[PDB]
Amino acid sequence: FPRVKNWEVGSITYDTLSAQAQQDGPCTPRRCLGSLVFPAPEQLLSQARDFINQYYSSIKRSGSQAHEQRLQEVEAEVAATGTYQLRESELVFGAKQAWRNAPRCVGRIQWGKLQVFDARDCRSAQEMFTYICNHIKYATNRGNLRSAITVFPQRCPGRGDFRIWNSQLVRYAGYRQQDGSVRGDPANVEITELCIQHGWTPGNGRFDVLPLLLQAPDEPPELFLLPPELVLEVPLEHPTLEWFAALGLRWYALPAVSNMLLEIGGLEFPAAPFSGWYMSTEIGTRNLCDPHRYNILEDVAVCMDLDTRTTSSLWKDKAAVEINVAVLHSYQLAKVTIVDHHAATASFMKHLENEQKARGGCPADWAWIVPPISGSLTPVFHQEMVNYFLSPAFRYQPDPW
Amino acid sequence: KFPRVKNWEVGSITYDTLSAQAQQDGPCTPRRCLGSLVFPPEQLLSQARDFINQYYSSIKRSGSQAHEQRLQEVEAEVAATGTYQLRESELVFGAKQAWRNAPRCVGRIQWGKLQVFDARDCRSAQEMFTYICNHIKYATNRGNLRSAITVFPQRCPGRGDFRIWNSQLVRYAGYRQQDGSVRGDPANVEITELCIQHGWTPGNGRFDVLPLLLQAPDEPPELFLLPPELVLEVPLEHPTLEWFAALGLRWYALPAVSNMLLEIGGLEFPAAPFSGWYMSTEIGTRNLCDPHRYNILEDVAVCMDLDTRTTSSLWKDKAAVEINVAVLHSYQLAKVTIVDHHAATASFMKHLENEQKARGGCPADWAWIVPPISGSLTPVFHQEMVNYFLSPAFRYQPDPW
Numbered sequence: 051f052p053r054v055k056n057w058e059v060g061s062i063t064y065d066t067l068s069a070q071a072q073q074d075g076p077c078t079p080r081r082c083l084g085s086l087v088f089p090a091p092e093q094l095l096s097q098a099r100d101f102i103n104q105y106y107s108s109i110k111r112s113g114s115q116a117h118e119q120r121l122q123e124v125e126a127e128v129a130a131t132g133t134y135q136l137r138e139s140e141l142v143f144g145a146k147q148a149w150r151n152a153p154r155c156v157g158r159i160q161w162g163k164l165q166v167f168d169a170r171d172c173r174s175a176q177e178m179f180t181y182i183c184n185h186i187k188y189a190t191n192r193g194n195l196r197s198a199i200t201v202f203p204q205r206c207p208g209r210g211d212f213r214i215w216n217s218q219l220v221r222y223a224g225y226r227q228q229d230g231s232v233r234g235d236p237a238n239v240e241i242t243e244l245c246i247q248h249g250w251t252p253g254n255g256r257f258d259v260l261p262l263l264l265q266a267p268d269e270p271p272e273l274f275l276l277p278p279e280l281v282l283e284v285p286l287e288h289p290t291l292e293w294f295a296a297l298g299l300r301w302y303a304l305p306a307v308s309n310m311l312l313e314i315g316g317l318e319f320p321a322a323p324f325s326g327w328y329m330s331t332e333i334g335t336r337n338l339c340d341p342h343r344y345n346i347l348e349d350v351a352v353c354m355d356l357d358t359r360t361t362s363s364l365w366k367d368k369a370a371v372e373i374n375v376a377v378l379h380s381y382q383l384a385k386v387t388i389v390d391h392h393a394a395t396a397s398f399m400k401h402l403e404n405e406q407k408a409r410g411g412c413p414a415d416w417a418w419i420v421p422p423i424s425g426s427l428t429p430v431f432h433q434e435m436v437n438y439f440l441s442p443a444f445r446y447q448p449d450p451w
Numbered sequence: 452k453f454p455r456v457k458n459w460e461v462g463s464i465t466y467d468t469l470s471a472q473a474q475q476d477g478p479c480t481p482r483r484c485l486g487s488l489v490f491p492p493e494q495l496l497s498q499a500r501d502f503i504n505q506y507y508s509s510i511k512r513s514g515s516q517a518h519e520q521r522l523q524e525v526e527a528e529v530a531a532t533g534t535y536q537l538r539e540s541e542l543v544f545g546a547k548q549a550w551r552n553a554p555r556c557v558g559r560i561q562w563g564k565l566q567v568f569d570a571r572d573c574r575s576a577q578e579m580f581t582y583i584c585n586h587i588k589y590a591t592n593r594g595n596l597r598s599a600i601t602v603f604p605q606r607c608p609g610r611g612d613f614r615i616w617n618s619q620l621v622r623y624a625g626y627r628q629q630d631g632s633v634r635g636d637p638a639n640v641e642i643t644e645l646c647i648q649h650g651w652t653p654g655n656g657r658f659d660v661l662p663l664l665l666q667a668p669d670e671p672p673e674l675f676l677l678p679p680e681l682v683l684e685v686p687l688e689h690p691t692l693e694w695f696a697a698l699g700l701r702w703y704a705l706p707a708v709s710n711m712l713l714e715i716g717g718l719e720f721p722a723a724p725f726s727g728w729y730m731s732t733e734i735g736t737r738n739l740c741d742p743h744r745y746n747i748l749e750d751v752a753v754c755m756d757l758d759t760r761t762t763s764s765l766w767k768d769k770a771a772v773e774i775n776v777a778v779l780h781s782y783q784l785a786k787v788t789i790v791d792h793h794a795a796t797a798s799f800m801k802h803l804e805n806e807q808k809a810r811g812g813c814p815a816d817w818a819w820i821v822p823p824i825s826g827s828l829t830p831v832f833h834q835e836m837v838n839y840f841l842s843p844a845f846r847y848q849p850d851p852w
């Protein structure tokens with residue numbers, strides 16, 4: 051039982067829940083690969099067996115009537131069909147659980163407040179698009195963001211997968227330039243190219259929202275433009291730096307990850323976009339200041355009159371902090387839910403406590419939980435963490451192209 | 452079986468073949484990752500053999516002349532005495548290699564530049580004290596700091612240990628009150644309690660330099676007052692916040708770790724204090740701003756008239772950048788060697804590349820290499836890293852009581 055210390059307080063707990071870690075991660079006793087970003091009917095049965103166990107624990111009916119039947123049902127169905135179907139309530143609980151179990155989500159205090167849209171009856175790319183618009187619409191909620199997920203039909207033998215090719219429902223075009231550079235988001239050069247290849251008429255702005263590439267089973271992907279009024283964006287300004295609005299920067303309201311696979315009791319949902327609300331550092335530090343992203347840090351520091359010729363002046367730190375200020379302020383001004391890294395990490399500390407009393411631990415990826423600026427200013431820095439894989443889960447999956 | 456290591460800023464890929472050598476098992480298993488945790492007879496011959504084969508290959512002297520020779524005399528030395536003494540050059544090569552291998556050290560680009568004082572003929576606490584004082588005054592060098600390690604005698608059974616009871620050679624006092632709370636440094640409250648418990652007159656202030664507790668073999672330890680002229684300190688002021696000086700903050704010039712156990716060729720020196728120069732975030736972020744440390748963040752923010760009423764003002768972030776600016780400013784004004792986290796991480800990237808060329812990898816603890824402020828602003832953040840144990844090494848060790 052791994053012992054876990056909080057260095058800010060001296061707290062000490064033992065993560066007994068790690069002992070249930072089913073699937074294996076990348077670390078050995080030889081080498082730690084923690085920092086790496088990217089680490090059969092009977093097995094379907096034990097996964098399903100376990101998840102059903104899980105589900106019946108949660109409804110306080112463990113080992114009860116419905117519990118036995120569901121096991122024998124699932125086994126008979128797996129025997130008969132090679133697979134099985136989740137009941138709707140099992141599906142709501144397996145999507146909440148998969149958010150609960152997501153080691154790299156600091157926003158997991160919210161894991162129970164999750165709106166699950168059952169789209170498992172989806173039939174085409176076109177219906178898929180409609181479900182997705184209603185997800186975006188429900189979640190955005192005019193800026194009062196709501197956590198939601200739409201579960202599209204599960205992988206099953208005989209039919210290809212549903213896939214959202216886009217890594218997120220809202221992404222900014224990244225056009226490779228004349229002179230070898232990128233206009234827009236360099237992280238989205240590939241998906242932009244695929245859109246163009248699939249007949250998207252590209253723009254030439256820095257914040258061109260991408261179309262959706264939606265793959266119905268055994269179909270080429272299909273291109274769907276998002277209605278501009280569905281995609282609530284936030285123009286970026288600074289509460290005191292008034293030249294900041296002249297940078298033309300924007301970010302969108304809704305972080306909806308669309309390329310992850312949702313796993314529940316051995317069943318695989320290759321298309322299940324989920325959305326919450328942003329933590330300002332993702333936008334302010336990562337998205338705008340990563341050297342491989344919008345990379346605005348030097349331009350802001352130059353505009354800020356900072357001395358960018360020496361690193362000891364901390365012009366990077368100063369300019370980044372005001373970019374994050376701008377993001378927070380711009381989102382409050384626009385009445386769009388946003389959580390700063392101080393508030394987010396402090397509720398994650400409550401999550402770890404709730405999770406310790408609830409499950410004897412909580413899977414947590416320190417390098418992803420700790421914010422990318424002001425790390426030790428937040429309490430999660432001084433919290434040791436045990437990272438491991440629980441199921442249900444959101445997993446990475448290969449890109450379908 | 453060769454870890455793929457990516458850098459996400461550039462896209463470059465390397466493989467850590469060096470990870471194949473890992474001796475002492477790490478804390479991580481396929482089922483859980485514990486990398487974020489801080490403190491997770493003739494066996495001597497295996498480690499002895501390996502270290503000697505290292506040395507000679509490093510001087511391009513594999514399989515010739517003194518190689519087989521030196522192998523015999525340690526085969527004979529252990530045969531006769533059950534231990535062995537290091538050739539002066541080997542103790543130097545082992546000290547440099549331990550530093551080279553310290554995964555958590557971000558300043559290893561400097562690893563080839565190290566001064567080894569040989570205190571292996573040490574006897575009595577009064578002896579170490581002058582050895583330490585020689586080191587200190589050598590390392591300090593009037594502010595133009597020079598890396599140094601003083602290696603005190605190795606370990607043998609039936610004898611006590613050489614131990615410096617302090618964690619560092621320069622540590623600040625920490626005193627309790629009629630209400631438990633601490634004046635001074637709470638990270639040293641315990642050793643501050645020992646120093647008084649061994650007959651030291653306690654001061655009043657928040658920056659009293661503690662006396663050393665030096666321990667000779669099989670002997671209770673002796674108090675030592677460091678020469679005040681030998682403890683180079685930097686009064687902390689801020690380039691443009693004239694009141695920062697008034698806050699009365701200081702830190703010492705020399706970061707000298709005096710509680711880790713140097714381990715070369717299977718020899719264990721429980722007293723081998725090493726020292727370099729600081730990186731400014733050690734002082735300005737961890738030492739002054741950690742809530743369990745000097746915890747000055749809110750004080751500085753009040754003086755800056757920041758809005759401490761809301762977390763989203765990023766007042767914590769703003770006051771922390773300024774505390775770091777003061778540290779860098781004050782050390783530079785005092786002409787004390789110090790390196791900012793940007794310069795430091797950038798050199799570490801340079802180091803990783805050197806080590807990829809030299810030894811095909813570099814053990815690196817991601818969570819300790821990424822600085823505690825402005826993480827993703829430094830390149831090491833975007834660099835994947837592999838953590839493993841190589842020999843020779845610096846190890847943690849129990850408190851000598």
Ligand code: HEM
Pocket residue numbers: 145148149152154155156157158160164197198199307310324325326327328329332389394418444
């Ligand atoms: C409601 C507020 C939420 C907040 C504030 C939040 C915050 C975050 C942050 C900051 C990350 C790190 C991503 C990065 O740094 O690039 C993350 C990752 C993640 N989140 Fe949350 N999140 C929220 C909601 C959700 C929801 C609703 C789900 C699922 C239903 C979810 C599942 C995940 C997953 C699976 C990851 C890992 C994705 C990856 O590894 O790239 N999160 N979250």
Ligand code: HEM
Pocket residue numbers: 546550553555556557558559561565598599600711725726727728729730733790795819845
């Ligand atoms: C010359 C400039 C140097 C710089 C800027 C530097 C910087 C650092 C920093 C920032 C850490 C993180 C420790 C913490 O934050 O608590 C560290 C750890 C460490 N350093 Fe270096 N260091 C330097 C030289 C050296 C030397 C000369 C040695 C030994 C010969 C050394 C050995 C270590 C070890 C063993 C650790 C890990 C200690 C632990 O885990 O507590 N460093 N260093």
Ligand SMILES: CNCc1cccc(-c2cc(C)cc(N)n2)c1
Pocket residue numbers: 157305306307324325326327328329332333336337
């Ligand atoms: C820089 N963020 C990229 C990224 C990558 C992966 C996940 C997110 C995410 C997802 C959700 C549901 C909320 C949130 N706040 N973030 C974001």
Ligand SMILES: CNCc1cccc(-c2cc(C)cc(N)n2)c1
Pocket residue numbers: 706707708725726727728729730733734737738
């Ligand atoms: C707040 N850091 C405490 C700490 C803990 C452990 C080591 C250091 C250290 C050691 C050396 C040789 C240089 C340096 N710059 N740091 C510092």
Ligand SMILES: C[C@H](O)[C@H](O)[C@H]1CNc2nc(N)[nH]c(=O)c2N1
Pocket residue numbers: 085086087417418419459832833834835
């Ligand atoms: C290379 C390194 O692991 C990588 O940049 C990680 C570090 N920690 C992170 N943490 C979060 N939350 N998001 C990220 O994208 C990353 N990136």
Ligand SMILES: C[C@H](O)[C@H](O)[C@H]1CNc2nc(N)[nH]c(=O)c2N1
Pocket residue numbers: 057431432433434435486487488489818819820
């Ligand atoms: C809990 C966490 O592992 C712990 O606070 C570590 C994280 N990274 C660190 N990094 C450095 N350089 N120094 C530290 O003390 C720590 N503390």
Ligand SMILES: [Cl-]
Pocket residue numbers: 305332337
């Ligand atoms: Cl994002």
Ligand SMILES: [Cl-]
Pocket residue numbers: 706733734738
């Ligand atoms: Cl220190």
Ligand SMILES: [Gd+3]
Pocket residue numbers: 290291292
């Ligand atoms: Gd103005």
Ligand SMILES: [Gd+3]
Pocket residue numbers: none
């Ligand atoms: Gd006034």
Ligand SMILES: [Zn+2]
Pocket residue numbers: 077078081082083084479480483484485486
């Ligand atoms: Zn690990």
